Write a protein that binds this ligand. Structure first.
Ligand SMILES: [N-]=[N+]=NC[C@H]1O[C@@H](n2c(SCC(=O)NCCc3cccc(Br)c3)nc3c(N)ncnc32)[C@H](O)[C@@H]1O
Ligand SMILES: [N-]=[N+]=NC[C@H]1O[C@@H](n2c(SCC(=O)NCCc3cccc(Br)c3)nc3c(N)ncnc32)[C@H](O)[C@@H]1O
Ligand SMILES: [N-]=[N+]=NC[C@H]1O[C@@H](n2c(SCC(=O)NCCc3cccc(Br)c3)nc3c(N)ncnc32)[C@H](O)[C@@H]1O
Ligand SMILES: [N-]=[N+]=NC[C@H]1O[C@@H](n2c(SCC(=O)NCCc3cccc(Br)c3)nc3c(N)ncnc32)[C@H](O)[C@@H]1O
Lengths: 259, 263, 260, 250
């Protein structure tokens, strides 16, 4: 079938990449980096993110799989030692994760695998948080972070967000160093929104914001509204053994007694 | 239909109750506190909790409704002044029902039998004097070894209660999940915990297993009873749901906004 | 000089105790009534009991702690060093290090009771919601509603205070730290959220709103005080004295406990 | 004496209103050797007045007027400008000395350090002893008076300015098995030095109050409580905690 492999750029990833293509050189597999059905990422989560955005137009036609050449990742969950076992077994069941739809208004749309953040471009960050066409709070601080379920283990976790299992179709809004005084009273707690819930970020003073989607920071000028909602689109993973989400959370933050 | 009303106990709630009973007494409504189809709580959220636990065996045949005689509650969403419009719409049967998820707490001893509990807000587990030390096993796999005050597993609707004060996230009740939060974790080299709140979906089981002490203080919606010789405490989203009678639209986030931001 | 030793209670501590006492058998006399050197064997909780056992002779006592289990913040010396400990103290070749303490004063409806804390002093309700007014230096600061409040010593910041999200303070700083316990921080009961660090001569007064019965704990000594009118917190003028031999930095001790 | 302005018309007019008063009591406007510096505007305006005279802090008593809201440095309302000139005890606050590797900086609020286009990974060395390996957004070392600013938003504690210390807070620490951090804010006394050492990237974005500068080839960033103190001119009694109350509690 049709496949392609991306690389982090270093020698370890390039070497493992070519060796797998050679491995694919022992089965009925065709290399296509234009119309693939299987995209293989080699490196880290950041590499996996780049592979996701490289083919965010064919997510319905692509099953992703990740190998971490460095530390254990949440998307790159396969070890380099299992590269032989991978080409054999793929030549399987599919697992789908939710995505975050980001809409900007001046309309531009973005898909997030991890999260979408909004900060100021040269002053204090002051916006109104509107939930389902109804005003909720006025935020002032560094910024706001709307995270995907799979992305809760990333920037979200560092910002004090909760960890949600990816089978839950939702989004999580977390504060970034919010000034919580008498003028700008915010909820403080992270907020988890279900499907069809729209979180609208509307400017108060400055209308130019620094918006990043999976760390794709672009400075949007003359912004009228930033809308957040659970995308109807989903990323598909190729599953072979059972590597539970909580196990990956455990091995990353608690301990990994066999490595 | 068959209905009943519970009261907070003060004059305002008792007075409103009798007036509503008289109101239903002008339609095809029968007062039945044994097999009701509509349970109306008058007072606060704590009052609503008592009404829920009073009828936890008939949740599938009961639509709850709450009236707050004091401050706005998350379960008590009706003002006393709308009791008249309430009786009219309940007698006509002009309402749709909305369901919230619940938390099943299972305790296991050295088999004496086995006890199960349902929570609307949350279920907490603490020590009976000394330090609280348990192993957190997620779906038959060890996750962490906890040492501290205790742990708190919350329902989606219960996230606005104890969960929020403990640093938990707020989840919309339409989401079928449960949320585990730490209660003063020591989080050191020996007892390393995740720190972050954990949100578990359906069919996920959180098993708490004792390390030294086997006596735990278990609370379900603030009903703390001392269980001795505990072998296992299991948490999972119950298949049972509490049903609410909806008339107008009072959004959860609006209820959160009005409660914590400003009103 | 005169010394005495306390034990955690288990065999490891009791055996290590007798072996050390046997070591002193130097010009050292065992006196548990008027001791000059107090040796704690077990854990920090054991050290706390030894501290409160002789809180009336703190000016004439240099404390030292041995952890038979994991490393503690007061019991910071390992059991393998029990021989070296007895030797160095018998010559009297050691300097003294002092840590600040927390004075807790309760006022009723009767007299007034005072307590000394090495770690912290906490106040919770004795049934139901905990609602008090936090008054700083005779001036109202906030109205708290939740589980309780915790006023911590500098050395005690590494204890309960840290689990509650409090900051860690170096014990050389003469101060106290107030932390919240599950505040319902809403529109009616708006709290500061942040931990508050108070200097000397600053008085934090906790005054009841409705319920007047509170659970007051001093270094985990919980007693039910009835008819409470006021709970006062301030840095005590008294200090706990440690026997220093080598250099075991506070931050190094924090590192070994939480980082490693 | 001398007077600084926020830049807007409100401050300039108010400045002129006070300056006319001083020509009747025996004080001459000197922006080279002032003994009393008057700030008109906000806390941010006060910061500029502080940084304008970091070489004469030992010979200057500061005073702030807020044309807007109650500030933590600007505690006088414009209506009390008249009472000021008549009276015009000293109160000293601790400061944060920041050393880059040699550049030295004084901070009134805080000093933060982040990366210049990637992950922020440094070794936190406390008194020549390794404490932790940090990975995240950055770190924030705050002065006692600055704890009510950026420090508070980062979850730091609020400490009374009479306490001579500094407070380190984390900025989005990943805190995993590899990069285990303390999580808790750390309050350091005098003579304690927190040394931040690079692991891979050596380019960092360092900010002092509000002077964000991109340092390349950084070998070490040292933090310690400065021996210098900022002196305030106090007339009435405005307790720090009431000021905290008025701002965040309401
Ligand atoms: N009251 N009542 N009803 C019981 C609910 O009260 C909520 N709750 C509990 S009960 C846990 C407990 O033993 N708290 C001791 C002090 C206290 C008791 C009751 C209410 C309050 Br407020 C405080 N504490 C909570 C808290 N600190 N913040 C916000 N919700 C809390 C729990 O989630 C229960 O569901
Ligand atoms: N045992 N003992 N030592 C008492 C000390 O234990 C420290 N401590 C307390 S005591 C408060 C309490 O009653 N907690 C209930 C469960 C518990 C009891 C005792 C130790 C522990 Br751990 C847990 N909780 C602490 C906590 N969660 N984290 C880190 N230090 C704590 C306090 O600072 C006391 O000074
Ligand atoms: N690679 N990469 N970057 C993409 C992911 O990095 C995650 N991430 C971001 S990106 C936000 C940012 O600009 N951070 C500046 C410092 C930094 C950048 C990238 C990684 C790290 Br670690 C630190 N910060 C994160 C954080 N502090 N903790 C744990 N994940 C973070 C985001 O969720 C992105 O998904
Ligand atoms: N000039 N000026 N501003 C600098 C002051 O702003 C205080 N401050 C900063 S600055 C951090 C930052 O880079 N924020 C994004 C752009 C920005 C510039 C100036 C002010 C603000 Br806000 C934001 N954030 C703060 C925060 N989140 N909470 C409370 N105080 C904050 C810092 O403590 C400085 O003292």
């Amino acid at each position: 079938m049709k496949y392609m492999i991306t690389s982090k750029g270093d020698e370890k990833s390039d070497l493992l990449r070519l060796n797998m293509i050679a491995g694919f050189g022992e089965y009925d597999m065709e290399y296509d980096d234009v119309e693939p059905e299987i995209v293989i990422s080699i490196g880290g989560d950041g590499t996996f993110l780049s592979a996701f955005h490289q083919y965010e137009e064919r997510l319905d036609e692509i099953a992703f799989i990740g190998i971490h050449t460095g530390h254990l990742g949440f998307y790159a969950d396969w070890r380099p030692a299992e590269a032989d076992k991978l080409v054999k077994l793929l030549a399987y069941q599919k697992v789908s994760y939710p995505l975050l739809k980001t809409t900007v208004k001046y309309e531009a749309t973005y898909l997030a695998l991890n999260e979408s953040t909004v900060k100021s471009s040269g002053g204090p960050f002051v916006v109104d948080v509107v939930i389902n066409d109804i005003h909720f709070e006025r935020f002032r601080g560094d910024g706001l972070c709307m995270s995907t379920p799979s992305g809760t283990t990333a920037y979200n976790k560092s910002l004090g967000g909760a960890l949600m299992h990816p089978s839950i179709e939702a989004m999580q809004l977390t504060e970034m160093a919010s000034i919580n005084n008498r003028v700008y009273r915010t909820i403080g707690s992270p907020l988890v929104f279900p499907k069809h819930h729209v979180v609208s970020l509307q400017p108060v003073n400055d209308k130019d914001f620094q918006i990043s989607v999976d760390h794709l920071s672009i400075l949007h000028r003359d912004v009228q509204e930033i809308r957040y909602e659970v995308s109807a689109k989903k990323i598909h993973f190729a599953r072979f053994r059972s590597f539970p989400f909580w196990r990956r959370v455990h091995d990353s933050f608690i301990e990994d007694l066999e490595h």
